[PDB]
Design a protein around this nucleic acid. Sequence first.
RNA 1: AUGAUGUCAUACUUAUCC
Lengths: 332, 183, 95, 48, 79, 103, 49, 100, 836
Amino acid sequence: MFLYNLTLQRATGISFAIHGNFSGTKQQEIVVSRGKILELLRPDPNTGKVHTLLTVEVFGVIRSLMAFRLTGGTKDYIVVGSDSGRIVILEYQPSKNMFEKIHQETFGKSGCRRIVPGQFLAVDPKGRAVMISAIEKQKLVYILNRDAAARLTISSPLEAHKANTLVYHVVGVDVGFENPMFACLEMDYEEADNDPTGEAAANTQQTLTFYELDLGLNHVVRKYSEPLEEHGNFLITVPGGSDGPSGVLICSENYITYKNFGDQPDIRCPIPRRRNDLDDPERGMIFVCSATHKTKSMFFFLAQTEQGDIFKITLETDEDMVTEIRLKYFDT
Amino acid sequence: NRFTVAELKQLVARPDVVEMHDVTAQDPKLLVHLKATRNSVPVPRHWCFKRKYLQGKRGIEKPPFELPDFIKRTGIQEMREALQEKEEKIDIDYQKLHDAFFKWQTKPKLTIHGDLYYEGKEFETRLKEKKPGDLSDELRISLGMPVPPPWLIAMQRYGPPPSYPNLKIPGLNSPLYGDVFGT
Amino acid sequence: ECLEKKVDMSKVNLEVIKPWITKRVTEILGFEDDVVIEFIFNQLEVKNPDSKMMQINLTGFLNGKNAREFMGELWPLLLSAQENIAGIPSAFLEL
Amino acid sequence: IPYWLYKLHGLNINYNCEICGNYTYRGPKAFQRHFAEWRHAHGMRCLG
Amino acid sequence: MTDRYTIHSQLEHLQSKYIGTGHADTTKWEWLVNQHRDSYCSYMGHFDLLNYFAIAENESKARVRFNLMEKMLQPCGPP
Amino acid sequence: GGVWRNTEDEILKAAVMKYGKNQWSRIASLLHRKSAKQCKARWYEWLDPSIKKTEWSREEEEKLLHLAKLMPTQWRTIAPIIGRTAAQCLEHYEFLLDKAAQR
Amino acid sequence: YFMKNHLGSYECKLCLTLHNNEGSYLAHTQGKKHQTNLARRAAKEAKEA
Amino acid sequence: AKHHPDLIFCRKQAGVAIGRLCEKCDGKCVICDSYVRPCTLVRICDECNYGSYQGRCVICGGPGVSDAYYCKECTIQEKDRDGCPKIVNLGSSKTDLFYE
Amino acid sequence: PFLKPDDIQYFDKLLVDVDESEEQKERKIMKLLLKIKNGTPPMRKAALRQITDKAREFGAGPLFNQILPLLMSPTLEDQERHLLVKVIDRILYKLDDLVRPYVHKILVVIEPLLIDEDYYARVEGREIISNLAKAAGLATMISTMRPDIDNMDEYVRNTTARAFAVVASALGIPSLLPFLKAVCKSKKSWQARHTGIKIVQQIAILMGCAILPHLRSLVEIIEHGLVDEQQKVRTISALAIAALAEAATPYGIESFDSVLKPLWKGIRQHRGKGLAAFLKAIGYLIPLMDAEYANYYTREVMLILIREFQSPDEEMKKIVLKVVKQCCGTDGVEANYIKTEILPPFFKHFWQHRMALDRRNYRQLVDTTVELANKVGAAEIISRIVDDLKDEAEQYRKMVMETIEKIMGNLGAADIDHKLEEQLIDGILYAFQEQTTEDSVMLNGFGTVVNALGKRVKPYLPQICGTVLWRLNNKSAKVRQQAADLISRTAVVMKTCQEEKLMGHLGVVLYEYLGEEYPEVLGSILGALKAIVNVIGMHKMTPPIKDLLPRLTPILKNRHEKVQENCIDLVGRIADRGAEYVSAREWMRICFELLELLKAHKKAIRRATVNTFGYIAKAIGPHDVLATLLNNLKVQERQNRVCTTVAIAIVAETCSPFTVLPALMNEYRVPELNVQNGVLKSLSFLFEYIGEMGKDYIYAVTPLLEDALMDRDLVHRQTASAVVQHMSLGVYGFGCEDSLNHLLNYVWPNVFETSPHVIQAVMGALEGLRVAIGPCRMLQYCLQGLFHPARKVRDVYWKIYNSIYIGSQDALIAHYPRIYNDDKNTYIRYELDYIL
RNA sequence: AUGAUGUCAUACUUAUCC
């Protein structure tokens, strides 16, 4: 019984979605990430409809999708993190209607292993380097630099592993063309595995560690690290440099605390809930996703809660520090 | 700190797979659960032996190997033997070898997924359980009866066998075609 | 032992620990050398030093008996300097 | 006197099968074979 | 503070550097905790398995991911 | 070559007992280690049944001591006359008598 | 008990061992007393002496 | 490998330096040590290729001419996604041969 | 085995025959050393093992007590030394905590190995000190080696510094830092600080590229010595900065930052060696600076650099040389400034017959000149150094020759004008006409020159090849081989320009020398023929192949390493490419001659041989030639056979094995064992080469593997297992897994044994079976074995389970069975039991 | 009737190597 499998309707559920100038023009594309296929969407600004520009099956489980662009460039790249042991940089060609792989370097074995990188992938906002790390005990950072013929080239990756440390979510810090830092939520499970009484398992909170990559030394090191008050689920990269102050917003259960590195004090804000909620009061409230809208004048953020409450996140700031985080429920 | 074998066999639901070396493990419950799985295979018998599973066949000098019928029906073995006798060429055919490799291809006797290689694995040619009422050809030839086997004539007089009580054999209480005269 | 409590050299001085370490090295090794003073300077250069690594470096430097007493005397003086709000040991308050 | 042969074979080992008419065994393999035997099954059938 | 225990090296041999491989003298609880950590990492890595695990429960995806990340350290307790 | 192992010595003794004595080519075709001259030399040196390989006495020592001065060379001529007839035990006994009397 | 191999060597059937040369199989005659171990097979084949 | 069992590999971090093979060790694989089915090229470490250590063979260690590649049997067995297999140690090989 | 007349002093205790009556018997039996030192190679081997396994028994004390005198012996050999080094290693792989009292007592003899003329001696020494330091403890090493720092002799200080370098490579920089950082600040005496700084250096050389992380701390240590009142400390300090920066690949510039401003200042005021040292440091620094800051700073260095060309110091000239490379090889430097200021003094003082006779100065000079060419251009440098091709001495001619070679290699010959090109070709011929020694430099030089000139060389050919023939006589022994090789490398140029008469010449003229009795010549001749074949094609060969090939055939007896090489190569090229020109009879004769070429001691010979044998296998067809392979006596155990096996493989590829297999499988029947395992190997390599096509033949091989894997003798299980491996990788994903499971049954018992080759074989086997069958079945065989407290089954099944674990760790999740939860722990994973 | 160790040949592997 020799069979032949065929696909009639492709998967419409999207696991990740990025936006940017992937086509290299003024129109922005919507790179959606399905289960076993990659999709490139292009929304019509006049007609108000989103058309599928390209649809290619990657023949694998893509676990991370991010976009990046070099300084002074006019097109956004496509970093694709899959279940394979290699990192693939894709560049879509509108003249050929296909995604051309720029670089492909192997880092480990295949499969969705805990020691195999591909679950988390963060890119620098300046386009100087990309950081790919696993769920635990594996972290790699490769440098991206343009060639003489304006071709994107990758360098040797830098190993930044840490034993008995679990990574929840990683995000690159927005630096003003300085040394790029990669902030991530860390959790050391070495003490909890060596205590049968369970006392070391309790009172073990997540630690926000910011690992800086020294470009002059060509090596990454954990520069800053600080424990958190509660366990966090996701982070929000705040734009810094010339546009706004540097820092990151850590989303947690019924609380949000943006804590920048240096002398910036930690400012926390609880998550607002609906009036006369019919749900159980013992259950918490966390964020599901977050969007960032950056402009030349100012910048805003839009994060949806567990109940789908999309709130307009705004952060008042001083000359060099942050003042307060002012949130307002936009819609449902 | 280590439970006995009787306590480990009384606690396990399938005590027909417990061994004497399983009590010296660090977790006998997980080993007993994994050893009683549906499609699991046991470990080799060289875990306690000291012959390294390859030193027991010292004096055994049997046939090194046997060629299949698809290679023996091509005439290459006789030509190779003639060339070896001349040294101590043929050019028979080119399409007959392709025909013996494609059309006259014989599927070999494979094994089951749990059929692991034993130590000897040549003197225990066991095969199901050819019981009462079912016999092989040749022994029919020694018996020499043309198409009941005649001592089921005496299974009339002396009675149905104690050893296989459920028995039926043809013509008596079992009302037979080819070889098989009882079920 | 006495090398299990976590300490920190950033909250203690360094100029007040040189004479006690010099007297301990002159009592242990007999004479005055330049490798032991450099090892004592390198052991206190870090803001978070290691007591077990310093004991191993000085645990065998002598013979394996005076070095343990030297480590036990240097850990208690550093603990008394870090526990005090000034950052000085007990031998510096009198003189 | 084959002391080493009896030690390697497993002789002079304390073992007893109470199911096989409270008999004693000189080895662990002999105790395992005596638990499933004709006398042990006969005693189990006579016990009920 | 004589400890007489300097696990440094011998002849550039062994020196386990991987995580989850195990040894011949590995205990049952340590192997069970390593298998549970590998199962948690495989649940966090596979997107379809995480979706099938979150569709059954009434919790969200990020809450289940944070619960699986928080339960990775000391899952059993006694190694 | 010519290590003269015990399993080869037993095969050479069996070939000398079975085939014969004056047929050296017939005995060399069943050993695959030595030639016919080496097999005949081994049969005349160590595999001979009349060779007295032991029992060194004082009469034979006095006979060999009263013969090495009359003929200094030609030890093979005094091999059958002394009674050893091995052509190497005479030189070994002469070396032992020269080393023991030197001190 | 002498058996020939397929590579120009001898193999002992009673001793169940290999022989490197022709002198090796010829020295396992006085030695390799597998002939004394055949008394159990002779008693199993015939119960009488 | 099958010729030298006491040799140890480098297994360092993979860089951007493409590996090379000497003229005496041309065509031989690094892991599988075979001559057929080349599927993946060999990448060297950053410390293993610097200055006078660049352009040298991985297995032979001599003057590299052509680029080295990995076997397809080692590629399908995931033996090529490991670290840089640069021959660092050299024991029981080409030591007594220099005296003769 | 015999005692040298001196060694009696050591081994006298063995001479006395008193025997059989404690420790005295261990020293007495320890004379097995003597068996290692002097004797037959087998005695050395067996002795060496016997003493390895007795390490734990005898202990380090008696050994070293009875060794260190020998390795200390004034009469010691080269070999004997090296061997005692070996025994020290092999015993130090075992003894760990034991050696602590003897560490210094070892190093004292060993540290002289680090400074030595022999290189292999040095890499050995570094290795065994690595094994010692890592073997002993850090504190053991440190506390050990202090008193040698202030030792009066500087020798021990130096070699001790390299010792700290080795131990620091062992135990890492950060562990040893506080020791050093304590040392360089020692206020007692300067000699210490000098030592410690030298230690910084030798760490820089040894660790090299890997210094990078701690570079900052290291600098922060060393910086305080630059200003010291003593001189040495300053000199060696700045030198150590140099070594750092040189291992400091284009980065960490700011770590050197605070070091600069003093250095530059010192550049002004210094006379003598220290000055040059600073120039060394700054030299390696400049490539690490910014082209703007380094603009200024560089332009300052250039002055002193100019002025200092003229010093007689050769240390000076080395330094300032490499400097000129780095400073003037900077992208931020202007050509004309170099052309005027530098080149005339450069070629004046630096190009002289003092330099070239030396080695390092030779090389470094070559490099620097090459780079100056890389900037100012080609015609300048070459144009100035051409006239020296005609200079008397060789080594000088060799120097300018290789220089021209590299130059025209990089920049290309396009820049060169006409007249200078005449002087070129004439120079190269002239220099080539007088060769005192045999070497490539002149030849590769010529070839690169011509291939670079392209067809601008065409007017020069008749002069070339005239010289080529006349030299092609002169002296066969010396120059025949060389003129021949010259043809070989000039082939393509003598082709593309379409001079056909010249191809007639070389064709039949070279054809005539094939009767040359000198092998070292004949080899070069055949090589030349080869190169001529790769330019002019088959049917256009002026010596038609009908002539040539049978004329080649008898040469295969020639034994010679170069004849056999080139010969077999050429027979390969022609046998592969045309192959029709020659009748089959000739071919099969070639076969029966090729058969014994497999006695070659060289691997490449066998290489070309087997590949050829495949080519002619295509020229004829399988059955006959594979039968001629199966004729083989197998006679040699150590290889000499399995190459024929490889021929069986490649032959089975060249025409479909779909034909060949039944003959082989029948030939396993033969009672001769070594050829049985032979055909097993043939299956192994066979599947390795066929790959996917095994989707069918698996079945055919399956029962035979059953017969083989069922063990007659270990080699059967081993080789058959390898077959299972390559089959298992090859068939992957095509749906044949069932029979592979059946074979896995018979594979499985072989798991247990101590024989290295069969256990590693079985490992490869079960790995391939892992990927092919899928992990689930594997793990279902590997479960119960884990548990087993018996010191064997657990070792192995855990080794296996690890092999299964590392790969496919992601896919294992489903297959871990249900394991009930005990009191303190919950062993049920309930996530999988959530049901919609 | 395996297995034990030990003197002592004999084959085999490592594409071992001038």
